[model samples]
Target: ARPCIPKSFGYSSVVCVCNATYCDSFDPPTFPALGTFSRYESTRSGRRMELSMGPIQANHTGTGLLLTLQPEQKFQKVKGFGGAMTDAAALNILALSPPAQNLLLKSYFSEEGIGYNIIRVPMASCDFSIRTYTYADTPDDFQLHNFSLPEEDTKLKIPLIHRALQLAQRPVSLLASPWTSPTWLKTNGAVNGKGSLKGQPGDIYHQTWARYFVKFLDAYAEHKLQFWAVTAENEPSAGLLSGYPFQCLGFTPEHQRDFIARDLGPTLANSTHHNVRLLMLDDQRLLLPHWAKVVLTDPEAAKYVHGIAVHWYLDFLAPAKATLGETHRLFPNTMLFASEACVGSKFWEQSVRLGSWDRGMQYSHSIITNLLYHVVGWTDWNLALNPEGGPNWVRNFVDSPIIVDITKDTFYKQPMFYHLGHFSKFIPEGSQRVGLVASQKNDLDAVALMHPDGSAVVVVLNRSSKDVPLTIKDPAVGFLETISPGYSIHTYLWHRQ
Candidate 1:
């Protein structure tokens, strides 16, 4: 309800700062009156406002080409959008006062704000945690009798999750994924080093590891936080890469395939939490289709898995058509969930780039591109991080959409936050992505969706350096025109008039 408290870091975009009493917010646009439409935009030059409504003129642009929304040609049903509530994310949030904490959570989960409905929880500890420890670290304990949820789960993690659940206007779909297995259960006998789960499929070690997931689920359910989905592992490939420090568990697609079918699958099916969805290959697209081919082709593994979970790492290295697109084409039934992403995680990148507009643009561009390839949902990595982007145990620092400054007792909303808003705020669940009948524009990346209510949402990320005139025509709802500013993103909405 407050105007943006703009703070610039010379990044050509301004971050909106908030304390207990004030935070910028954009309301859910009232459904437009018949024959009119609503537009919301976050420009690179500092504007996050609902613009004036425009008329929807029917059958006017009969000659030239336009971005036509074909609501009839719908693709994937959107799951939702969100970020990870890792140990560090929750910790940084509590670094503020009680009121500011509520202010921050409301900014994300409330309807008047970005309204993120998907929540990802790291199972135990990742690099983002203030420390490293697993649910069961007792060495050589095959029965995992020593296994218990860590203090951080109750003290740091679940409390924040509880607050988010209360504030969220939309149904929050919670997901959990593990970064690494306990040290004793791994071949290398260390959580940080190159290693894989010890023993073959169906062995005691593999069975215990499979049961581990169920135990984690039971613990959370005890607190009344039931999960909607879970991944087999976080970046399973990273643990195998030499000298890659931090918590990781390695698995080949074949190995993971066997483990899931032989152990994790049967165990879960027999457990009380049988219906909890299972996802595999929580890694990069570079391993796609092949990974999917290996696991999914096998009737055993494919039957157990609900879908694939992909990360943004290696996106630049791997082409999407060959990976994401191929995976979808090959296994159309299985979902493609973009499970984790963040900026500043690469080796050469800075940990935190305050006020970086391009980073925001990157998020929007990726979401549109992922949607184009049939990704059902997108989730950012950490909800909030310190200005240093850590308490990272291994210093694997990364930027997040919201950065906390403990010294200031305030948090800053980066351009990335608003970029996510252009979709998450307006696009509700059950809204299927529809086709756009238009020639591709090199300068602008866009996607269209139709809500269950039959309204259309057109998201345009005009990345060009110069303004571009564009036409948004919904075949049934009529067409509207606008000039998309360079390096800006917009969301358009209206019911058929």
Candidate 2:
């Protein structure tokens, strides 16, 4: 018997009788664009062409019309092309020898390879580091006089990054973020977990910390490298919550404003390092509104912040786009970069380990979603990790697109790598997004592009289990293609009429 509830409980029950009926002859609804024939003659060569098509309609909005390419539907989008930098930790492991380093860099920088352009470096040691070390020396010394690169990093990290850049053959952008400041600067005097710093307001710590930024910039420049962007902290608000191995500081938005406006910005402005731009808020999406409110309200802080940064963990792409669209409405000059995304290999492997092919679909889905949602740059968590997913000091490791085995001396590239390749390989820098509409009520997603050379490419993903017969129409280019998207990723290219 079911438990009795009070009379005040607002509940009701109803029963219904059903009647069965036989099916009538099957008839499918017809779309104007579907099952159609069109013949056209070229004005120059006088050739006639006929093509069959699917139903076409132009009313697409929300996530319904997944992607469309408009070569001519151009926006004055800046930072037209970019990518992420690998951390020193992963590189050092991959470049244990001269031959290994050459092989690794060649694969990373080759046009047909990973094609990563923007690189991100952790200011100190992140969980990705084989070990953690910072410049802060001695107790009670808020002034970071003992800063130095650890021997291991010199052996691996710097060499890997510099070499990759040299070989990429394209202008690369570098962004640096610190997992935590030196232990001496924090309230707990350690870099391992959540703690507030002791210095603020009247404390001389702000000025001293500013010196730290200058020192790092100078040191990197000495190595013939320069940073394209710098964030005051990496996941500043959430580093403590996310289980990173480095010292986590509780930096409120107000504190970030004070530090940037009063300290880091002014120091960089006065220094010889005039090229580096400042980015703020490396935390995930949940804290976006908190960052937006603070940064937008402070004129001085806002002026220094070139763009807002975020990670992709919380599935906030939709909301992130909304927030970004609004931010652009208010501040058209500001930019947005999706700074961090990891756990793809883990996200895929764990599901498969637990017996699910959904993991495979997820790998493709996350990337496509992020790109469609207006993320300018996407970098996976670890470019290269071991089979077990780490040399990570924290021991919480996950797979990446490329995996290397130290003992076995082998490597494996996940299917996700190919998925990224479908875009990064063909869509070279300066290629513009064009409009390519998709079939209505179908699992088809599409993005079209007009190449700089007057060619066109349409990238479509059919998420359904069955093959989809897709029809695309572009009057501008006279492109008519029947897309049979297998239950996987597919891209097609065409030339203009």
Candidate 3:
């Protein structure tokens, strides 16, 4: 007769009962205890780091808010979390002393820092730049005879990028976006404000513009700076108007579709830099569904494109997650990236609030919501800004994680910095987002992911004014009970057997 096996398992022990003859003793699989870490920011305490929590069992019964996680179910794999390395960001870094620059870079790219792995680079000047410029400036140079990077970028931006790469100790992905093509190639004959691409589809100007992208890619490669992706145009829908006060090149959906299918797509396909990805719609999320339908529906354009890049500006007008989910449902194969976001006077004319907890909460909420809905990557508008929010020529100042007090020869690390670190520092690239479920009544928002090395990362946010009790339950690891204080962000990590 076989020995009888016991059926129940305990948090730290297991019992197996079987007929004594066949199975007198049995050993069950053992699961290691979980590891917990947290960062809290609120009006009363500011940013505070508590002692790390020791391993705890998940079998506790709590009468507080309940949050459940399904590690077995998985979703999109994360690409990365980062911010742009714009002309302004680089210029600001250069203004600081060498030691200050090194501190800023290490705080953003090093393991001790936020560990940002991706950066956006503007192809030319934008509102944030000191002045309007382009890679190729010669008028009527249809064959791009004058196509070349300017001293502003080669001398300033390239060196900054190289230092960041060295500190990262990894290949950082760069997404290059252009505010406008050369002014001469536009209908309005100016780079500032609104202008449309000159000539019809497949015309000489269109073809030359396509080759311009290729040349730009080649130039960056010469400096050992490779771009991971490129957007067709920034804010393609924003038409140029008098007193518009910024750089913008408008392209209708039809115009963009034709450009991609007829010119840009084919040029890149035959170019030596064919491996670079092509993303469309570097604009708001409200336009994602319509734009994706218009462009990706075309076989020729869809074949050459990788995904959609969306900004967060229009989220106030409409719920972005709905449109994002709709776009993902329609084009499951297309990756969705949150390309740019910031808090600025353009939305609300408020002074730069250094170390504002509200701003940090806003970032956390948006990031958590976007990640749950299907955003594969999230990149902030700028990595660092001045104490006054910019060196922006247009006075379009905005907040950033790190704010430099040039006069003081130091920088202020805002709550937004640590808030972003809750995601970027622990959840690295290639982590698979797993299933997360929270009670409807709770004041907590959370997202969970499983790392490639068999570890789990769960980030939770409490934006409410009152502390919220949370019990995290994982089938394999058991339960964890923790209290999330109001206006705070928490990242819990653990290994699951």
Candidate 4:
């Protein structure tokens, strides 16, 4: 027989809130009511730490709160982190509808929402799994003569994204990726799965790929769209099983370096697209060691490359923060962008088992973990998909924050939307992460932040079946908050003048 697995929050511990003075009144509508508790002080060897006054425990249901920085902490000067993806059609569709777009902008980018500042658009087509596409005619010339938007994306995707931007109060950054070359340019003559193009043709195809980027930049510029970064290829390591609509040529590091540094970079730099940076290797976090070793060791590649892009699929194997720290140590200037993740695991299947509420919990866990790792930005697999999940060509589509019913002109905000709201709504651009010390408890994971404006943001994760009370202590802030742990998450916002 297989070994037994324990239940969630099964290894529980207890805690008491020591500092009740800093807590503002809890809004009943926003979170559960598990009133505050006090703490006891202890001193030993000229040092002191507070102890719990009493064990006022309640049933843990995973319910917790998130506290944001006071004004001073909020204003802290630091590099910002955010997420984006290549779903112009879906975003544009949402933006076309006032109510839908408002909810998206409010939950994803608003100060009262997840505050996502960096976004990504696709160079051609990606596993965003919309209909397949690419740019250029001969696949050998650096010219973009045959480049054109498919009837579908042009009619809907671009418009939806433009309108969503209009709804956002703050400016957001954009990035782009290309999934595959035209089918004619690859070894398999198809772009659906893994395959490599012949070697000699790879060089010319690469040059055309760079031109594709220029064309995209020029095309979007016509409508005032600008990209902050561009990944040479989405998961170039995967070839195609990873998801593409055309045949793929898995470019090795040497190939990427030669093409990017020797060819792509010079072409883009000579053109009017100098401001657009080249983001290399959009892969999973676990590949950090391999990717970093390659990108950092090559001076020429390092010169043209900006940073690394990764997804959440490797969360179980690697913590993003550690990977980022390693990469930063090698190349401090390189940034880390969390490019994609969504619910597709059998454990949380979307077809029937995964309720929208459960989906929300998944979003919360994914975001919280990534944020803890100091990820600069995060973009979901899709910004919006049909209620049934998608018109996916691969039959592997999943729900996004917004579930649109285009026929009804109505949409539903999935749990991902609200879960994302918990962070984006309150944390604005330029807010730096302050010191956080999470108490060791089976049912809870906590992190505290001091915002630039002298405010504090505390996020509590309750994984138990009973309620756990939390007390925060620091020279700058103090708080007494109780969290219920039935798959619950909470945020607290307080000023520390």
- For each candidate in turn, the TM-score is 0.97, 0.77, 0.90, 0.76
lDDT of 3 by residue, 155-217 (tens): 888898899899885468989998888888888888766678888889888998899999999
Per-residue lDDT of model 1, residues 7-104, tens digit only: 98877788899887788876555898878988887888888755668898866643433787776787999999999999889999998998899888
Better of 2 and 3 by lDDT: 3
RMSD of 1: 1.4
Best by TM-score: 1
Ranking by lDDT: 1, 3, 2, 4
By summed lDDT, the worst window of 10 consecutive residues in model 1 runs over 57-66
lDDT of 2 by residue, 1-497 (tens): 11111111111211110011110111221222222322111110111011123323433233233333456665323232333333533553454345554554554565535466767777667777666667665665655667766644465567767787877766677788777667777766677767655678335677777777888888888888888888778777754454445556667888888888888888889998867998888767667665777876898887788877877676544464556555556665666667776553334334112111233345556555555544455555566666566666776666455555455443434444444545554455556555555546777656666557666555566556666655555564332434443445655555453
lDDT of each: 0.87, 0.56, 0.77, 0.56
TM-score, ranked from best to worst:
1, 3, 2, 4
Instruction: Look at candidate 1 and tell me the lDDT of residue 61.
Output: 48
lDDT of 4 at 414: 45
Give the higher-TM-score candidate: 1 or 4: 1
lDDT of 4 at 31: 21
How far out, in Å, is residue 443 in model 2?
A: 1.4
Comparing 1 and 2 on TM-score, the stronger one: 1
Candidate 3 lDDT trough over 10 residues, lowest sum: 11-20
